[PDB]
């Protein structure tokens, strides 16, 4: 299985895909690959829950039912090594609405 | 662009793997589209047809195009049945958006949704068999 994620942190948001058997630490390499920042110095969350480096994303609860191309799942990302910042994800813009339709 | 009148029985299975109500459409010996009873979203149905006959599939409510065995036209071609797997295509994001919008709004009120006038004419250009048969009948 591929798993389709949205790696989200601050106003930053990464779309990527990964195997269900890939590890949290391996997602961390992917981020490093991209945001130029090494596995230590970053932490990943599902919702608020802090994720263990050695677990599978499919054990962390990203699965194929769950992380679908067209409705990917979110992974929270945090930084600094040196005391770590807390998990903040900026919400998206609100749609207006509606009208004269329903 | 019509059915071949071969008179050779040929037995088909329409399997609808789409979330729509499917309308199968048979092209008649003079090229005129001919509609058959509609096939629900999960559902399947054995069909007697004939070698060389043409079919194409559409969403029964709104005529959106659908694919059969990946191409646009199915022709019954052994040892029992031939499989017509009816699927959504990967719509364009624009077409898709048109669909929702058409589906959410009495077509009288397109005029009154705040968008560029090239978009109003797009919404009112509903998909239709006849038009598509003319795109097809040219390649």
């Amino acid at each position: 299985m591929d798993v389709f994620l949205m790696i989200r942190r601050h106003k930053t948001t990464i779309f990527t895909d990964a195997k269900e058997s890939s590890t949290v630490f391996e997602l961390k390499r992917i981020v490093e690959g991209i945001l130029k920042r090494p596995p230590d110095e970053q932490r990943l969350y599902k919702d608020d829950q802090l994720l263990d480096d050695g677990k599978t994303l499919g054990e962390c609860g990203f699965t194929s039912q769950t992380a679908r191309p067209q409705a990917p799942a979110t992974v929270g990302l945090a930084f600094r090594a040196d005391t770590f910042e807390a998990l903040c994800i900026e919400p998206f813009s609100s749609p207006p609405e509606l009208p004269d339709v329903m | 662009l019509r059915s071949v009148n071969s008179r050779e029985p040929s037995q088909v299975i329409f399997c609808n793997r789409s979330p729509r109500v499917v309308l199968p459409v048979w092209l008649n010996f003079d090229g005129e589209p001919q509609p058959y009873p509609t096939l629900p979203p999960g559902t399947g149905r054995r069909i007697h047809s004939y070698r060389g006959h043409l079919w194409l599939f559409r969403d029964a409510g709104t005529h959106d195009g659908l694919l059969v065995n990946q191409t646009e036209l199915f022709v019954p071609s052994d040892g029992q049945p031939i499989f017509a797997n009816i699927t959504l295509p990967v719509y364009t994001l624009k077409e898709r958006c048109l669909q929702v919008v058409r589906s959410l709004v009495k077509p009288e009120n397109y005029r009154r949704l705040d968008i560029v006038r090239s978009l109003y004419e797009d919404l009112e250009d509903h998909p239709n068999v006849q038009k598509d048969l003319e795109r097809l009948t040219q390649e």
């Binding site: 948001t13 779309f15 191309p69 813009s93 | 959504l88």
Partner: protein
């Protein structure tokens, strides 16, 4: 490999090049990063899903699912989809 697309309201969207090259508009704006002065993050996050949807399912035999669109975002999405040619 990856490129950056940024919404009218500053959020960044980091996505594969190829996925992004699904829009000829985007294809042309890279010829790296691209700012969209006129699409808010709630619309451009769907665009991106659509890219990832398009790339996953284009050329596929196992049944494909419906790409869903909320009613609230349909109008903004239509306009983006039109602009972005995709």
């Amino acid at each position: 490999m990856y490129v950056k697309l940024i919404s009218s309201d500053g959020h960044e969207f980091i996505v594969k090049r190829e996925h992004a090259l699904t829009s000829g508009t985007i294809k042309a704006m890279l010829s790296n990063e691209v700012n969209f002065r006129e699409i808010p993050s709630h619309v451009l996050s769907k665009v991106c899903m659509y890219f990832t949807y398009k790339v996953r399912y284009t050329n596929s035999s196992t049944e494909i699912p419906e790409f869903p669109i909320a009613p609230e975002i349909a109008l903004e999405l239509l306009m983006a989809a039109n602009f972005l040619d995709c």
